[PDB]
Design a protein around this ligand. Sequence first.
Ligand SMILES: [Mg+2]
Ligand SMILES: [Mg+2]
Lengths: 221, 228
Amino acid sequence: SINYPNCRSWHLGVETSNIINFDTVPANCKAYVEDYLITSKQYQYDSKTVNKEAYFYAKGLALKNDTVNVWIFDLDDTLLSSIPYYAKYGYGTENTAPGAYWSWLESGESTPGLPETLHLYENLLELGIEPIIISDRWKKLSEVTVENLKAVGVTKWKHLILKPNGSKLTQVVYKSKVRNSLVKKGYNIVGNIGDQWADLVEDTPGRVFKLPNPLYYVPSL
Amino acid sequence: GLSINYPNCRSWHLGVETSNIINFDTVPANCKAYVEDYLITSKQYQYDSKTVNKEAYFYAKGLALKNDTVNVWIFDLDDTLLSSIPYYAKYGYGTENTAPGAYWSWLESGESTPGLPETLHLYENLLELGIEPIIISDRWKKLSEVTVENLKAVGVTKWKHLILKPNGSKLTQVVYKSKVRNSLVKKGYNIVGNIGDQWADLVEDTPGRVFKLPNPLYYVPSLEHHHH
Ligand SMILES: [Mg+2]
Ligand SMILES: [Mg+2]
């Protein structure tokens, strides 16, 4: 229905949540997305600036020794990249069947790490902030997820939380349930990083950081 | 005072638009060329603004609005309907410190702020849908006459209310705007949309979908709306 004559303008719209609920990347934006994500290195530069901002904030906090100080991480497209998968399917311009990405993950296919986020993850551990990784992947994918994290140098976390098999919950509601259970256990959430605004609903404490993602959209509240 | 290093200006700008970067004091000195290029040379500002106003309009078109309900859309003024660019172009495009009051003094003298045509198109289209615009501005009341003149000059005339800030008020912009919006709710108005160039304009403590216009020039402190 809406034409997006300028692909950079569309992309800013999606990053700011001015444009929501897109099922696919606009066809005319395929080359922009590929060039953004790979050739131009703008995705890398954008990612580095976000992670650096998170770190400068994190290293200014006065952490108390008597509480569990935590930082929430998303997994897909925050720590691990789905780019090799999307690259085969037209960088988000094509429809993909639900469950297909998961099947791909089950096939022995590893995902590359996102090194700017991995640097942040390592920095937070050094500051004594405890990462909690919350993922919408089904619990059946636990072993393959742990293997992939190990392959990118992530082996320590306070919790790695996956979604109950065949859960009926939307991603936004499931992640809100998890964060609220964390608060309830007395954890002090100081920050939250993810590539979807759905990951970053401000219903629990901590500063939020939105990693770029032009490939796809997860509905929010 | 404390500098912060941003070797990629575009990454910096995306950070400020998303609110990953907040409360910057001035534009990074190395990003002067970028901002001038973004706002004027490249026309990217225009294309970005067009996209935002277009989504807003297609959203508004899709609402089922009752005739008997006062259905309103909130507009910001500066860098939403009227542009501060001619002022900032004098001061390194946000890279230099400007005394507080300096901008208001510049407006008071009757300096022109050009219209932002993409927002003006949205404003006109909303009137056609029977949605009544309300303009909420942090400009002091004493700027009411120059404000009305600059609005008339760019083709804006029918608003339900034009609300300026009490002279000398000690409220922050975010708090003042929230108090105004909340009073509109109490009046029984139905806010269906809200558009502005600062997150401070767009706190979701009152109803309506929010749309954030681009602005690399400055940052207005904001507050997060606690969800349940
Ligand atoms: Mg993700
Ligand atoms: Mg403004």
